[PDB]
């Protein structure tokens, strides 16, 4: 009978304590910006304390010391971590044989296996086996995607409404069936009826769409200078954001990578110029909105 | 600080020049290389102050590369060192160093490749 | 060798577990290895940082001119009938 919180879409961010601990463990050390020699990713349990065979092989091939990495990992990950929990360690080794490693939460497959209590080789794709795996809902997927953001400095971005699409795609690739999709009906409510639930879903859907739109506009308008240089942008820049970008130390490396001709910044700029030329060449009038031109294309094939 | 909309070859060349100046041949080039941001839309520029206090400003025009800027700065550095030696200034000579050993590593790599 | 092995002093470093537990690991422990121990930190040192002498520049220019002449002569060496037919067929398949 007890409900945690009744609010139209307010259970988005995780608990304050776990978010603080995640900002502590999963952090972004200041990258120097030197030339990258190697990019490696491994899966290491935080509970155990030993030198892994693959990381030791990599460090021996590069001539480095694996004991230092093992010591720092076992001194930073052994406390405040469950027993036998995997973590994704991404190591970046530069041309000076200097390595910088970051720790990341387990992958979506590990999260799904832990949530479903299924062990290894207990799941398979439908085109390979012929039958669905254990049934799931698109709420455990939400709770899983809550703990896998792009950067732990801003857990709200990217949006859960976008993370859940990727996690449900991964679950479907694994071979799991769902109740909201791949099934015409969801789990029934005992206290409510079908028509009331349908109209409630409609109103909740429209208000959640309003919330998603306003949050997307907010996050797209307010973004740091690194995000402005690495991602597309069409909004003005504030003086406080300019000052924050100047305070940021990675601004130099970001600017150099963006000025590199094959950067995503240059890709997006060339795409936008090509779209401008496309409108100028296939536009009825001068002030042809891109949306109006898309409607023109849709109505005129 | 902000990046120009159209591809700014001048900005790219000046950033590459700063990168190569940080990676330049010196025991600690960080003590001599400094980077600054101009929010006043000041055109990207370089200012090299020699040991005597004289300043040189390599003009960064459209089409110039980081290699071109380095060539200009090094030719002017040779001329400035000649002026120092003629004035009577005692200059430290060029010799073998860890930068030269690393360049030897790169040279052996190139020789083994082709 | 077992005594003077690398990282052998770690067995004497930690005198007790109390100090090891009190020592809190910071994020700077991950970044303190991204810097060289003796020399300075440099961004990049590639083949494009190898200065060329006067004779090296002359040799490279002569090599580039020889490559240009070799390409010009290969354009006529491969000007055979069947080779031209194959080239134009591949060009048509690429453009279409």
């Amino acid at each position: 009978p007890k409900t945690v919180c009744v609010e139209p879409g307010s259970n988005r961010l995780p608990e304050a304590l776990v978010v603080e601990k995640a900002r502590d463990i999963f952090g972004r050390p200041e990258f120097p910006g030197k030339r990258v020699l190697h990019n490696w990713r491994f899966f290491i349990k935080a509970g155990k304390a030993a030198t892994g065979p693959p990381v030791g092989q990599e460090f021996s091939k590069l001539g480095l010391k694996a004991m230092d990495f093992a010591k720092v990992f076992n001194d930073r990950t052994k406390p405040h971590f469950k027993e036998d929990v995997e973590l994704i360690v991404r190591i970046q080794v530069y041309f000076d044989k200097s390595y910088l490693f970051t720790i990341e939460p387990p992958p979506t497959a590990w999260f799904i296996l832990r949530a479903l209590r299924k062990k290894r080789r207990e799941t398979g794709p439908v085109p390979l086996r012929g039958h669905y795996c254990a049934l799931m809902t698109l709420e455990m997927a939400y709770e899983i995607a809550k703990m896998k953001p792009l950067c732990w400095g801003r857990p709200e971005y990217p949006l859960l409404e976008t993370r859940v699409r990727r996690v449900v795609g991964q679950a479907r690739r694994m071979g799991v069936c769902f109740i909201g999709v791949d099934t015409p009906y969801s789990s029934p409510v005992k206290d409510m009826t079908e028509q009331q639930y349908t109209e409630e879903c409609e109103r909740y859907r429209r208000i959640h769409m309003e919330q998603y739109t306003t949050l997307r506009q907010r996050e797209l308008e307010e973004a740091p200078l690194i995000e402005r240089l690495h991602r597309p942008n069409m909004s003005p820049l504030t003086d406080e954001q300019i000052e924050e970008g100047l305070r940021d130390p990675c601004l130099l490396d970001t600017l150099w990578r963006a000025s590199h001709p094959l950067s995503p910044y240059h890709r997006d700029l060339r795409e936008r110029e090509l779209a401008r030329r496309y409108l100028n060449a296939r536009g009825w009038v001068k002030d042809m909105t891109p949306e109006e031109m898309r409607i023109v294309f849709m109505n005129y094939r | 600080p902000l990046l120009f909309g159209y591809g700014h070859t001048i900005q790219k060349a000046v950033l590459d020049f700063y990168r190569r100046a940080i990676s330049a041949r010196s025991p600690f080039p960080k003590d001599k290389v400094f980077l600054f941001y101009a929010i006043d839309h000041i055109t990207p520029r370089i200012e090299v102050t020699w040991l005597d206090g004289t300043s040189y400003v390599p003009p960064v025009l459209e089409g110039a590369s980081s290699q071109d800027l380095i060539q200009m700065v090094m030719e002017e550095a040779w001329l400035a060192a000649d002026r120092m030696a003629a004035e009577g200034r005692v200059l430290n000579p060029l010799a073998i160093d860890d930068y030269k050993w690393d360049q030897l590593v790169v040279f052996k790599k190139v020789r083994d490749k082709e | 060798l077992h005594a003077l092995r690398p990282h052998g002093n770690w067995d004497y470093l930690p005198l007790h577990n109390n100090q090891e537990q009190q020592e809190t690991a910071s994020l700077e422990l991950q970044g303190m290895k991204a810097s060289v121990d003796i020399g300075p930190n440099r961004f990049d040192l590639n083949e494009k940082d190898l200065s060329l002498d006067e004779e090296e520049q002359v040799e490279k220019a002569r090599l580039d001119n020889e490559l240009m002449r070799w390409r010009r002569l290969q354009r006529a060496q491969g000007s055979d009938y069947d080779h031209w037919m194959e080239a134009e067929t591949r060009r048509i398949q690429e453009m279409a």
Binding site: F31, P32 | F36 | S35, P40
Partner: peptide, 22 residues
Amino acid sequence: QRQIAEYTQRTPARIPWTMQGL
């Protein structure tokens, strides 16, 4: 009458500590 009726700097960069601490 109708119109008035309608009318009425150079900053130092921050080097990352991995490059600057040495």
